[PDB]
Amino acid sequence: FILSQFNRDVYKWNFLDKVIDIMTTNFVSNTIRLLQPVPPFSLAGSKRKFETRTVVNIGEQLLLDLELLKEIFHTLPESVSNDSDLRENTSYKRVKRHADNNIDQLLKFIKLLMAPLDSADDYYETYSKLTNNNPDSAVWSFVLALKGIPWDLALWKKMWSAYNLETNRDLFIFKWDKVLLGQFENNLARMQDPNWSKFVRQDLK
Ligand SMILES: [Ba+2]
Ligand SMILES: [Ba+2]
């Protein structure tokens, strides 16, 4: 027997939990659809829709969006409370920590999109910092592609070498749109160029 399903108070907080995740997912999906590379991938079937400098600017704008979002989240609890004696609820805090948690991730994700690509080393320092040392190469790649880098194998290896040299599955921000990452992975294996083909299957995997 399950009694919590008939409790209006338990529900309202679960609902805010859902609103939170919905908004987080939209923020993530829109960002990716915006910035992601257009299949088929190659130096042809290109240039990239945006230069990396512009992606950085975009990142900057998302920070202001993220800020407004944060405020919306801090506001949700007030929508379910007529009684605002809020030292509790052991449930309210759960909601607050949840909002705070999602914002942090977004923040990292964006901070990461805004990172410069001047040195492969400096980029590694911040990539591992911001993803908590995520060893996944597909994630790494999607991120880099999202950053706006063109399909320059020389530059990719330039970037990758530093990463590789220093490095259950953690999908980072893609926790929120597994499918887009999956498609990205597929498109990447479908590259016609033999070098790329070899770079993908042997160097990245
Ligand atoms: Ba600028
Ligand atoms: Ba109220």
Ligand SMILES: [Ba+2]
């Ligand atoms: Ba290694």
